Amino acid sequence: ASLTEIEHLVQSVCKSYRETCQLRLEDLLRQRSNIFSREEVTGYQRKSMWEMWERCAHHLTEAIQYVVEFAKRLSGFMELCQNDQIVLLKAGAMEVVLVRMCRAYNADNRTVFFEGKYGGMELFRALGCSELISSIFDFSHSLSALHFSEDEIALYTALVLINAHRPGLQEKRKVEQLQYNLELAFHHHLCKTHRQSILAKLPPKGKLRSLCSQHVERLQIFQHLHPIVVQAAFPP
Amino acid sequence: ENLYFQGASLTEIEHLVQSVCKSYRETCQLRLEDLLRQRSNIFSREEVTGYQRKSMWEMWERCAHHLTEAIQYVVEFAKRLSGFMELCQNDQIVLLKAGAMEVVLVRMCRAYNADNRTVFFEGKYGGMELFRALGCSELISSIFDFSHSLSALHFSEDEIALYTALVLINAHRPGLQEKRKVEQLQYNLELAFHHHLCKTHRQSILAKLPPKGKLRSLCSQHVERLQIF
Amino acid sequence: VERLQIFQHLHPI
Ligand SMILES: O=C(Nc1ccc2c(c1)CN(S(=O)(=O)c1cccc(C(F)(F)F)c1)CCO2)c1c(F)cccc1Cl
Ligand SMILES: O=C(Nc1ccc2c(c1)CN(S(=O)(=O)c1cccc(C(F)(F)F)c1)CCO2)c1c(F)cccc1Cl
């Protein structure tokens, strides 16, 4: 890989992210002022855990669809066998959703963008998942301190997905090559933008993984009793 | 992994009928009563021209959206069938990859009016001329012909539920890992379907069902044109 | 239909 090929990979990953980010950073930032009132918060708190589950599972299904679209636009992902494509997305899509969340998170008031406005973790009281929600808000709080640029997120989330250590891969050597090219692209781009300092500040690989596992455990008890059919927007 | 992974008794077979019919009722997407009630709501000549003026790109997006949604409801129907979720993920993918579209094509006859040769599309009924921009005249015509031939059978909701359960639960799909479990599930559904046709004096529909390859050929012709778009 | 689309239909979450 030459300077030109690496740089093209950076630009491409960043374009694929821009096209699949779901919510524009400009829109999310200008809505930080639009905070849920005490009456609106109480309104969410009065809902059944079943009503909150369906609303949240709908938004989560939608977020996952955008992550899948991002993966499909990454060089070589499409060329991997269907098995390996499923293995990478089964293991990493949720983890990417957790990383993307920091964009919709305001660290000043500890609020998150949810259903048109910003609200604190108390909005989710009915779910009875206060420890898990708190961990989600803590993880988002820690990433927001890094002032992650859109391009840093694109490159970092591409590496969350393109991981050769996922159990069950049939073409491990192809994923390894794709991973290193993206690692080279990420490190090169950090050197061009004087952002070498973020690498040591990134959450340990195990942190996202455990949070994803804790999340999936809770999600399963909910979908076991309440499945839902949500509309899918895309592909080309 | 499930009671229907071995031969079921006739009492278990009647439970399987009721269950398949319930799963269908819960996942049919559009209620038969609503579809029959909207047969009067036909697209005007202005509305038809409006669809005809759209780009093939816009018609593709609208149609691919409606098809993705129809497939989701078929996937939901499969998941509610006894033993389907006890099959390995591989076999679940194989059955749905091979049969979901075919189920979609069968479910279409409910939204089809054989009197004026119209179909329910985006809130109203319209003829095949609505799809002109797609430049898929032969394929659309074949879809309307197949729906026309199925509508002649006057398929009841329960007959569709049982017939589409058998379209999906087919042990002959290449790539199955636990073929024997699919075979057991299939055998129980076949006896459930034949038994229910005997209870309702509807044994005559078996010989009227589309021949071997008809649904498959049409679904393959369909996936070829969708690849281009 | 394609294996990934099917998987995504089966496991939206
Ligand atoms: O909701 C759950 N998981 C979730 C995780 C990430 C997500 C989304 C959903 C989807 N949306 S969201 O619903 O607008 C939203 C927005 C912000 C914060 C949350 C918060 F805190 F609840 F996770 C949700 C975008 C963010 O990506 C959840 C849970 F945590 C526990 C049990 C059951 C469930 Cl369903
Ligand atoms: O449209 C295509 N495929 C399709 C097939 C079955 C479907 C649906 C879509 C989804 N909807 S629908 O779009 O409202 C509808 C309703 C009635 C008739 C049609 C007709 F004739 F177009 F097939 C569509 C329910 C019926 O199940 C199609 C094509 F034929 C050729 C090229 C590209 C494409 Cl996307």
From Swiss-Prot, chain C:
Family as reported in the entry's similarity comment: Belongs to the nuclear hormone receptor family. NR1 subfamily.
Species this chain originates from: Homo sapiens
Taxonomic lineage: Eukaryota, Metazoa, Chordata, Craniata, Vertebrata
Tissue expression profile of the protein: Isoform 1 is widely expressed in many tissues, including liver and adipose, and highly expressed in skeletal muscle. Isoform 2 is primarily expressed in immature thymocytes.
Binding partners and assembly: Interacts (via AF-2 motif) with the coactivator NCOA2 (via LXXLL motif). Interacts with the corepressor NCOR1. Interacts with CRY1. Interacts (via AF-2 motif) with the coactivators NCOA1 and PPARGC1A (via LXXLL motif). Interacts (via AF-2 motif) with PROX1. Interacts with FOXP3. Interacts with NR0B2.
Parent-protein start and end of this portion: 480 to 492 of 518
Compartment list: Nucleus
Protein name: Nuclear receptor ROR-gamma
Upregulating conditions: Up-regulated in the state of obesity.
UniProt remark on domains: The AF-2 (activation function-2) motif is required for recruiting coregulators containing LXXLL motifs such as NCOA1 and NCOA2.
